[PDB]
Amino acid sequence: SNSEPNVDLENQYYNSKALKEDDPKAALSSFQKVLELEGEKGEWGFKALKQMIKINFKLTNFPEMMNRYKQLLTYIRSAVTRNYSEKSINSILDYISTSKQMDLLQEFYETTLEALKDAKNDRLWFKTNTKLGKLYLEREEYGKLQKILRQLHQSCQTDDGEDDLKKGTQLLEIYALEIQMYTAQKNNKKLKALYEQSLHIKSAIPHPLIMGVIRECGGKMHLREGEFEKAHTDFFEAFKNYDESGSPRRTTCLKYLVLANMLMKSGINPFDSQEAKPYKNDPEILAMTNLVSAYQNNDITEFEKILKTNHSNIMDDPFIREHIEELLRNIRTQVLIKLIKPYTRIHIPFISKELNIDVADVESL
Amino acid sequence: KRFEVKKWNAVALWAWDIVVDNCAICRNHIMDLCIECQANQASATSEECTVAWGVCNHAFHFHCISRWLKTRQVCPLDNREWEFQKYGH
Amino acid sequence: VYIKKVEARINEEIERVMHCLDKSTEEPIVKVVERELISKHMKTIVEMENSGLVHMLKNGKTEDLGCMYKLFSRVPNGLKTMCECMSSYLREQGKALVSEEGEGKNPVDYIQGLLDLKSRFDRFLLESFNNDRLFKQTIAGDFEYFLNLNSRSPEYLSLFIDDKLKKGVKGLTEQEVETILDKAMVLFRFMQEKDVFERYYKQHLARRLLTNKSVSDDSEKNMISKLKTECGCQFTSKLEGMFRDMSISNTTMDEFRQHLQATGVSLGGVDLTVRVLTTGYWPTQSATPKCNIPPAPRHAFEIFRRFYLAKHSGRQLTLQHHMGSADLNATTRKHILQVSTFQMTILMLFNNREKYTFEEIQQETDIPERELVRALQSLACGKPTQRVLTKEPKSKEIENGHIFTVNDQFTSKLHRVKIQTVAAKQGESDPERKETRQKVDDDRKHEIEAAIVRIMKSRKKMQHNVLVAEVTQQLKARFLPSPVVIKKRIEGLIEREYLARTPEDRKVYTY
Ligand SMILES: [Zn+2]
Ligand SMILES: [Zn+2]
Ligand SMILES: [Zn+2]
């Protein structure tokens, strides 16, 4: 194919790249002279501006650093397509994040925000706003999170409608942000409203983490309401997404899936396949593996022994603490039914001794 | 030396196994039949009962998860969530 | 000129009768007059040809089309024949354009001409017909009729969208990009054989992602959202997994950056970029080869495999040799080269000791076939005055006993000189096109069987010809019914069971 981009611009850019490991005072001057060579726009001078910002951040020179970052922001909506400029500005933001001057960090962030607003960088823009929202959730901030959510929703509003048909990914990120928020405030009604709106309008390409979070919330809502199949499927998809991504929430999602699969009765195993030599033998998952092994074997005594032995990681979750009574009722019912299948006319105290429970509980069951 | 390699931009492919030795719906094993078939003989015709693999790499007997999708409900792990990516171990 | 005259006649007649007479008159006289005159003269003049609809539409007369639409809307059965003649003209134009006889036609030019014709007809519709439903339905049906006579159109549309997506040099801003993408998807709406189209789209994705890393980063999301809103779920999940792979690759990149930020013991991992892609979304290509690996790449692959088996356990990596790139720091200046994962094994053998030959690099390398020749000729054959791997037997064809050397070549001031002998063309040479056509044909052939069994298991049966109607109805949205093929295929299962037909008499099925 081939295409002659430029020879001299690349040559001086690489000369300054070599110079960067020498004294920075000369590297900055050479990079600034690369921008003077072409004059109009930059192309290789676009990367020269990024290098100048990096080196200036090394020798604490911020004013012209931010002026040249404004120049790069104007360069994003220039002959350089908004393709590698987003990676370049993400790298610049990460480099700025190295220091701890939060005032400078937020000045940089707001200048970037306004420039991207002016450049109508739709995808890049809500990617940046979603990143800011995730940062706010990680610091449990909602004052500006709410404003960001409202702005993103308004951008998603099709005047009459509050939603587009291709901004489904936008609304997906918005609802992921709101799902994290209402996990912080544990608001069940808003959680179900969010999950319904997401299920309806979100249909689009997801990022695996976002899909996993939304499916985790959906499974939580379903198992709070009572649906076992829907909760199991949601935990299934969320755990698949966590397997793909690698977030620490994988273990908690797998434990929730284990709880859900035991509650749908009909004798199914959640530790069978994915919980293997890597995950079946995991110390935080071995307790659940043993629990479901007893569930398969219908060993009520061993199941209760494991429940009492690892109560710090079995019923520690308030939700699993709520569901342990139902799980015990189900396993006792299964053991009783299996015991009374082969014969007829059996006394109650023998069943009570076999089940290691009170006689009144046996009568009620 | 006259030539030295500096960078690399390789692409690494991976395969999914999570090999285990147990089942879920029949509670028997990955192989060696299930609850709905028991023995090897009695109208098997080379044992038409194999292992089904999903897109998530979970493994069951084909009959097991087939009846799971048929008997209780089809919505849990439907054609959108559970795929059919392989047949046999 | 007749249409203006008759419109003036209508206006003068109605004005004269309304001003010179009462109210109980008017409608009968004008009704019968316009009925008779318009019917007769319309028939004659707009089905003869003389300045007729075909000619006034070919030259692009907007006012004539507008006045024709505004005049013929009053009389019934006028829009019907107008749309019939427009469809006939469109059929003639398509047959003149979709002609297969003659080899040497440019694909991109053909698609550009088809898109220009569609846009011109849409503009004429908007300007004259006032967005009439009948005209839109007729043009959509006509496009469906004349577009499915061939099978190379979807691939040409895929290459056009690849050209539009690779770089937005034309139309830097976003509004025109959005409009052209909308027009492209609208054109794709009236197209059949989506399987090969989406296969070629995936091929373009593989070409643009494995060779370029800065393609759009913002328009990929728009592309796949349009695919979500346009297509169903057959290979849209393939695209989902394709993008999931990039997401996991960048997550692994940042976590590995945190890994080498915390020490790193030995060196060899100077500047590495390892990526995580799945086998279910990126195909092998040919065979999953088993070639050797250079030493620094060997260390990088070992480190990545150890990490993936330590913190991503439950899955093992498979090694393949088709993709990747590297930078080769050579050394009067130090110019860094570029090796695309194939010649870097030869450069490994040279790092150990150069002045080798073809036998040396074919015996101690486990190196593949003529792709090796193309990779090796990159550094020596067809080289401008920046040669970095010179040889004594200067010749065009490749020998066996020929020695390689190195020339400093100070003229090569470029410190990132690359040899892009690969990716010479993107025409999709017949072999892969035929194999994927066979693959998608088999896909359709088992999808139809899945549909027929899944539907007729929840329904009843037939005696001679009742069920065929239901399967054609449920496959109506997919493709043509093909009665002969399905009739010949339904009787092939009689040698088995599953509601067969019984060999002795084909009427008693295995219910
Ligand atoms: Zn089985
Ligand atoms: Zn059997
Ligand atoms: Zn499956």
* DSSP one-letter string for A190-256: HHHHHHHHHHHH--SPPPHHHHHHHHHHHHHHHHHHT-HHHHHHHHHHHHHHHHHH--THHHHHHHH
User: How many Cβ pairs within 8 Å bridge chains B and C?
Assistant: 120
- C-alpha of residue B45 to centroid of ligand 1, in Å: 15
- Is A233 an interface residue toward B (CB < 8 Å)? yes
Residue of A272, A280, A292, A334 to mutate, interface with B, max B Cβ within 10 Å: A272
* Rounded Cα–Cα distance for residues A46 and A54 (Å): 13
3-state secondary structure of A175: helix
Cα A168 from chain centroid (whole Å) = 17
Beta-sheet pairing, B11-16 with C275-278: parallel
Q: Which of residues 261-320 of C touch B (CB under 8 A)?
A: 270-280, 282, 284, 294, 296-297, 300-301, 304-305, 308, 314-320
Q: Which two tokens stand for residue A62?
A: 């911020």
Residue A294: partners with Cβ closer than 8 Å, 6 or more residues away = A300, A302, A303, A306
Q: Solving technique for this entry?
A: cryo-EM
Write down the domain spans for chain B. Answer: 1-87
Cα C242 to Cα A205: distance, rounded to the nearest angstrom: 11
Distance CA B37, CA B47 (A): 9
Residues A218 and A186: beta-carbon distance below 8 Å: no
How far apart are the C-alpha atoms of C274 and B12, rounded to whole Å? 7
- Spatial neighbors of C175 by CB under 8 A, at least 6 apart, are none
| Tokens linked to C267 | 């060196």
Start-to-end Cα distance in chain C: 72
Report the Cα C93 to chain-centroid distance in Å. 24
Sheet with B3-5, strands from edge to edge, namely B3-5, C326-330, C336-339
Contacts of A272 in chain C (CB under 8 A): none
Q: Is the CB of B7 inside 8 Å of chain C's CB atoms?
A: yes
Sheet holding B86-87: strands in order across?
B59-61, B51-53, B86-87
B56 is in an annotated binding site: yes
Helices (H), C353-493: 358-363, 371-380, 430-457, 467-474, 483-490
Instruction: Give the ligand whose atoms come closest to the C-alpha of residue B42.
Output: 2
- CA distance linking residue A182 with residue A198, whole number of Å: 14
Largest CA-CA distance found in chain A, in angstroms, rounded? 100
Q: What length does chain A have?
A: 365
Residue A266's Cβ-count burial label (10 Å; 0-12, 13-18, 19+) is exposed
Distance between CA A337 and CA A267 in Å, rounded?
Answer: 13
The token pair that represents A143 in the structure block: 């004052």
**Contact C415/A279, CB-based, under 8 Å?**
no
Torsion sign across C-alpha atoms C256, C261, C266, C269: positive
Question: Any CB–CB contact under 8 A between B74 and chain A?
Answer: no
Residue C476: CB atoms within 10 A of its CB come to 10
In terms of Cβ atoms closer than 10 Å to its own Cβ (0-12, 13-18, 19+), residue C137 is exposed
* Residue among C261, C266, C202 at smallest CA distance from C236: C202
List CB contacts (< 8 A) between B3 and chain C.
Answer: 328-330, 337, 347, 350-351, 354, 406
How many whole angstroms separate alpha carbon C128 and alpha carbon C212? 45
CA of B23 to the centre of ligand 1 (A): 8
Q: Which of A10, A169, A244 minimises the CB distance to C414?
A: A10
Neighbours of A38 (CB within 10 A): 16
Nearest CA in chain A to C219: A123
**How many secondary structure helices (H) and strands (E) does chain C include?**
19, 6
By Cβ distance, the residue of B58, B73, B81 closest to A274 is: B58
**d(Cα C99, Cα A30) in Å, to the nearest integer?**
59
Helical axes A228-245 vs A208-225, angle rounded to 10°: 160
Partner-chain contact A240 B27, CB within 8 Å = no
Length of chain C counted residue by residue: 511
The Cα–Cα gap between A77 and A170 comes to 21
Rounded to whole angstroms, how far apart are CA atoms C13 and C54? 30
Contacts 24+ apart (CB under 8 A), C419-424: C419/C337, C419/C338, C419/C378, C419/C379, C419/C383, C420/A1, C420/A2, C421/C374, C421/C375, C421/C377, C421/C378, C421/C382, C422/C340, C422/C374, C422/C375, C422/C378, C423/A1, C423/C207, C423/C211, C424/A1
Nearest CA to C378 among C336, C419, C339, C337?
C419
Question: Among residues A258, A187, A251, A261, which one has the least CA distance to residue A217?
Answer: A187
CA distance C274 to B11: 6
Whole-number Å distance, alpha carbon B47 to ligand 2 midpoint, is: 6
Contact C338, C419 (CB under 8 A): yes
What are φ and ψ of residue B12, in 5° steps? -110, 120
Is the Cα torsion angle A239, A244, A250, A255 positive or negative in sign? positive
Q: Is A81 in contact with C168 (Cβ distance < 8 A)?
A: yes
Chain B touched by C252 (CB under 8 Å): no
What span, in angstroms and rounded, lies between the C-alpha atoms of C110 and A301?
76
As for chain A, the residues directly before each break of C–N over 2.5 Å are: none
Alpha-carbon span A358 to A355, nearest angstrom: 9
CA distance A127 to A333: 51
B49 marked ligand binding residue: yes
- Cα separation values, A152 from A164, A170, A201, C505, Å: 12, 8, 15, 68
Q: Is C364 on the interface with B (CB under 8 A)?
A: no
C228 vs A11: CB contact, 8 Å cut-off?
A: no
C-alpha angle A190-C229-A181 in degrees, rounded to nearest 5: 20
Q: How far apart are CA C34 and CA C29, in angstroms?
A: 8
Q: Is A158 helix (H, G, I), strand (E, B) or coil?
A: strand
**CATH assignment, B1-87:** 3.30.40.10
Question: Which long-range contacts link C161-167 to residues 24+ away (Cβ below 8 Å)?
Answer: C161/C201, C161/C204, C161/C223, C162/C201, C162/C204, C162/C207, C162/C208, C162/C426, C163/C108, C165/C204, C165/C208, C165/C215, C165/C216, C165/C219, C165/C220, C165/C223, C166/C208, C166/C212, C166/C215, C167/A81, C167/C215
Quick one: tokens of B32? 């060696």
Q: Six-digit token pair at A288?
A: 């659940």
Q: Give the C-alpha distances (Å, rounded to integers) separating A363 from A299, A351, A360.
A: 20, 10, 5
Nearest CB to C277 within list B8, B9, B13: B13
Distance CA C223, CA A207 (A): 15
What does the block give as tokens for A21?
């490991």
Residue C424 to residue A1, Cβ atoms within 8 A? yes
- Residue C89's identity, in one-letter code, is Y
C218 touches chain A (CB under 8 A): yes
The DSSP output letter for B9 is -
Nearest residue, CB atoms, B14 vs list C273, C318, C341: C318
Query: What resolution (Å)?
Result: 7.5
- Distance (Å, rounded) from C-alpha B27 to C-alpha B22? 7
Closest residue in A to B74 (Cα–Cα): A229
- CA–CA distance, A298 with A331 (Å, rounded to integer): 7
Closest CA to A198 of A184, A183, A182, A218: A218
* Helix, strand and coil in chain C, % to nearest 5: 55, 5, 40
- Return the closest-CA partner of residue C342 out of A288, B8, A168: B8
Beta-carbon neighbour count of residue C85 at 10 Å? Answer: 16
**Residue C352 and residue B1: Cα distance in Å, rounded?**
8
DSSP at C181: H
Our CA-based measurement puts residue A108 at a distance from the nearest CA of chain B, in whole angstroms, of 32
As a whole number of angstroms, the distance between CA C489 and CA C481 comes to: 13
Q: How many CB atoms lie within 10 A of CB C333?
A: 12
CB contact under 8 A, C218 and A10: no
Q: At what angle do helices A143-156 and A122-138 cross, to 10 degrees?
A: 150
Alpha carbon A320 to its chain's center: 23
A343 Cα–ligand 1 center, Å: 29
Distance CA C299, CA C321 (A): 16
- Beta carbons of B70 and B77 less than 8 angstroms apart: no
Residue B58, class by beta-carbon neighbours within 10 Å (0-12 exposed, 13-18 middle, 19+ buried)? buried
C356 neighbors C404 (Cβ within 8 angstroms): yes
> Are A86 and C217 an interchain contact pair (Cβ–Cβ within 8 Å)?
yes
Contact B77 A273 (CB under 8 A): no
Three-state DSSP class for residue B55: coil
Residue B16 identity: W
> How many interchain CB pairs under 8 A, A with B?
62
d(CA C492, CA A201): 45
- Cross-strand bridge partners of residue C276: B12
Using an 8 Å CB-CB cutoff, list chain B residues near A17. none
Give the angle subtended at the CA of B71 by the CAs of B70 and B75, to the nearest 5°: 60
CA–CA min distance B57, chain C (Å) = 10
CB burial of residue A173 (10 Å; 0-12, 13-18, 19+): buried
Residue B7 near residue C327 (C-beta atoms within 8 A): yes
Task: Taking the CA atoms of C189, C191, C195 and C198 in sequence, report the sign of the dihedral they define.
Answer: negative
Helix (H) or strand (E) holding A333: helix A318-340
Residues 6 or more apart whose Cβ sits within 8 Å of residue A310:
A287
What is the rounded distance in angstroms from the CA atom of residue C75 to the CA atom of residue C72?
6
Q: Please count the CA atoms within 13 angstroms of the CA of A277 that sit on its side-chain side.
A: 10
What is the spatial distance between Cα C167 and Cα A79, in angstroms, rounded to a whole number? Answer: 10
**Does the beta-carbon distance from C313 to A277 stay under 8 Å?**
yes
**Could you tell me the two tokens for C436?**
């994927």
B17 is in an annotated binding site: no
Q: Cβ–Cβ of A169/C225 closer than 8 Å? A: yes
B83 to chain C: closest CA residue: C237
Distance CA A195, CA A202 (A): 10
Task: Decide if C195 contacts C440 (C-beta within 8 A).
Answer: yes
Which of C210, C277, C344 minimises the CB distance to B5?
A: C344
